[PDB]
């Protein structure tokens, strides 16, 4: 149907805007701490601690599969990255400190992105 195609044109434009958003957020991680999943070879106990791991590479694979139906879903994943890190790692570590910075720097980007999604439907 023509309705189905129209919905698909909106998903596609959402996906375009979320790719820009993602790139902007990943820039706030110049060290690339959050770029890839945590290695279970290097942190074998990780899943005893963290039930839903997330990372930018995993968000990207979902994104290009148009796996994000709205901005909420995408924010949930971005918050997992941050929230997982701040649980596993202690306050005085480079990892926790990098999460805090990403969260603060990300919130600006996500503040305007929520306006563009509402604005452009």
Curated annotation (Swiss-Prot):
It is found in: Nucleus; Chromosome. There is a cross-link at residue 41 (Glycyl lysine isopeptide (Lys-Gly) (interchain with G-Cter in SUMO2)). It comes from the Eukaryota. Highly expressed in testis. Transmembrane segments: none annotated. Residues 9-113 form the Bromo domain. Scaffold subunit of various histone acetyltransferase (HAT) complexes, such as the MOZ/MORF and HBO1 complexes, that acts as a regulator of hematopoiesis. Plays a key role in HBO1 complex by directing KAT7/HBO1 specificity towards histone H3 'Lys-14' acetylation (H3K14ac), thereby promoting erythroid differentiation. Component of some HBO1 complex composed of KAT7/HBO1, MEAF6, ING4 and BRD1/BRPF2. Component of the MOZ/MORF complex composed at least of ING5, KAT6A, KAT6B, MEAF6 and one of BRPF1, BRD1/BRPF2 and BRPF3. Interacts (via PHD-type zinc finger domain) with unmodified histone H3. Interacts (via PWWP domain) with dimethylated and trimethylated 'Lys-79' on histone H3. This is Bromodomain-containing protein 1. It comes from Homo sapiens (Human). The gene is BRD1. The chain holds residues 555 to 674 of 1058 of the full protein.
């Amino acid at each position: 149907s023509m309705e189905q195609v129209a919905m698909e044109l909106r998903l596609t434009e959402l996906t375009r805007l979320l790719r820009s958003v993602l790139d902007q957020l990943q820039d706030k991680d110049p060290a690339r701490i959050f770029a890839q999943p945590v290695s279970l070879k290097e942190v074998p106990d990780y899943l005893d601690h963290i039930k839903h791991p997330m990372d930018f590479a995993t968000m990207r694979k979902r994104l290009e599969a148009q796996g994000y139906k709205n901005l909420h879903e995408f924010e949930e994943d971005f918050d997992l990255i941050i929230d997982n890190c701040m649980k596993y790692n202690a306050r005085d570590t480079v990892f926790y400190r990098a999460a805090v910075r990403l969260r603060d720097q990300g919130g600006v980007v996500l503040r305007q992105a929520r306006r563009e999604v509402d604005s452009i439907g």
